[PDB]
Amino acid sequence: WNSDSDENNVEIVTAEAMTLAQDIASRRKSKADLIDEGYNRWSFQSKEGLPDWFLDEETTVNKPNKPITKEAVLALREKMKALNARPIKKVLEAQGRKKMRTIK
Amino acid sequence: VKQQIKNDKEALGIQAQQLLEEPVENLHLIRNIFEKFDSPYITIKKLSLLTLLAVFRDIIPGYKIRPLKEVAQRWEYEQTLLKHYAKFLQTLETILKSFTQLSLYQVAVRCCTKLIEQASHFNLSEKLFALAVRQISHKTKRPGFDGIINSLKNIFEEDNLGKTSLKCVTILSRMFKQRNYDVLPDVYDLFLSVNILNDMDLPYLTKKARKNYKETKKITQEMKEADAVITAQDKEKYQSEILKIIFITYFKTLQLKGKLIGNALEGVARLSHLLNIEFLGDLLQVLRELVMQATREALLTVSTAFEIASAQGVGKLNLDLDLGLFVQRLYKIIFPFSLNPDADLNKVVNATTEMEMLLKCFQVFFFKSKNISSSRLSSFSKRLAIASMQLPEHSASADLALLKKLLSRYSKLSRLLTSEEQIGDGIYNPFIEDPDYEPFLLKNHYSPAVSQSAKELLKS
Amino acid sequence: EIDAGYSSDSSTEDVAPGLYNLYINYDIDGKKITRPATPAALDSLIASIDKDKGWTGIVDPMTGKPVNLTTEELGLLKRLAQSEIPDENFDP
Structure with missing residues (x-):
């Protein structure tokens, strides 16, 4: 009754994924249209089983460049904002040192 | 019988001594100790377990063994060593979960604590921590609980990097979900001990050796500078994740509104200054949303709200948030506190004994720079005297002593006073201004010393 | 005739959410729809503290609730x- 037996997930960290995720959630781009747009020249280049010397240079070079929207960029900055990113000291003395640098 | 036990103890001592002298060459002796532990005698089981603990702590490296003759045999040695250590731990959960036998369980807890204190950095620490916390997650204080919490507290203090603390915090959080955030109050105090959050002639060298020595020295200096920067960043990231897990546990505890609200507000007040500014403004909303032991809980909310506002530099960071709603809550809560009884017995913000926070909230209220004594303190103090009709005299003398040492020169507090606004329910006496009640009745009271306390007040 | 309908996959649809005041002004035929009460400040703070998967x-x-x-x-x-x-x- 105390067993720690505790799967697959995903972590949206790229601007590309956020723009796609925003389009899915905001319903601006229809989900059915997104699926159809996913049958392109790059999805048919399957990566299942390819070696690491091949896959590494395929990702750095042969990676389709999807657009990025400013709204998704803000969302990532919001996600990347840690709980202690701007505490009382890092907002007061950090602001104070810059102020006294400008004064000097 | 006794001779057999003595012979087995001697054999364990000889095997242990040989291991200390030559650890690498005698790995089979550890297997022999396990066979000796298999003896039915309880005392021999205890001695074998202790010798295994002593042997393991002596031969365990000070570094983390990196998994896979000068290098190969060392790897086989370390791989072989890990196998007994796993087997020894496997016996540990078996005997721990199996709970005469109580003494063996206490010994089992003891070696578990010793491994925690010393072998925290080593492999299988995830299993070691999980076994120990599983004993604490239970409703009742099992034997050795004081030893385990001390060991966990010591690790949190020494762990400057915060990786081991992060592992324990995650495991402690998992128990809280399993227990529905219903554990002993001492358990939540572990988070308070996280040091990461609380931090807020010469031998001759050949011509070739000198160039090697110089080359290594340059690497070490470059290694140190990069490590220092990496340590600062990793500690900062670990601190953020620890705050994430700790605060999410505290907020979940507040949502359930259990009996552990005391420790949750304790942690929230202690770690509030570590959190972001935007969260400070929204932190008081959850405190003020619980107004529909109800008086005791409201005391914690108003006291913690005072503590959060007490953070240095709030004047520069004008977050406002109008803590006056908490002020009026304290202004109204004194009457039910005077209504219900209270007993100190004999031998949660920061302490216990509810009367202690009240004076503590009053003294931080007084410690506020010019925030009071603007004819508002007197109105507050009047009901303070009214609420002082009961409770021990030392408490009664304490609150009267607060206004005695008060810098304000107002003297009409214990008599007719200016308008008693802010929820009223008392004599207003508007626009009176007369230097002319409660002490007269206070003189007649069970304890004789209240009479002289009233006399010393009117004379002073 | 072609009925001037809307197939279920048409790119035109009502209620297009956007990023972040709440746009609770009126409904079709012009009636104010009730504002859902703001979420418990505890619950909203929890969600902000630990963003939901796929936030x-x-x-x-x-x-006003997020999607x-x-x-x-x-x-x-x-x-x-x-x-x-x-x-x-799908067989590629």
């Missing part, structure tokens, strides 16, 4: 953003 940060104009990707939407985003067939069982 899009998108609120529909009607309800979060479901498990199937998270899977579709996984396949689409990794440039694979968005169909789990």
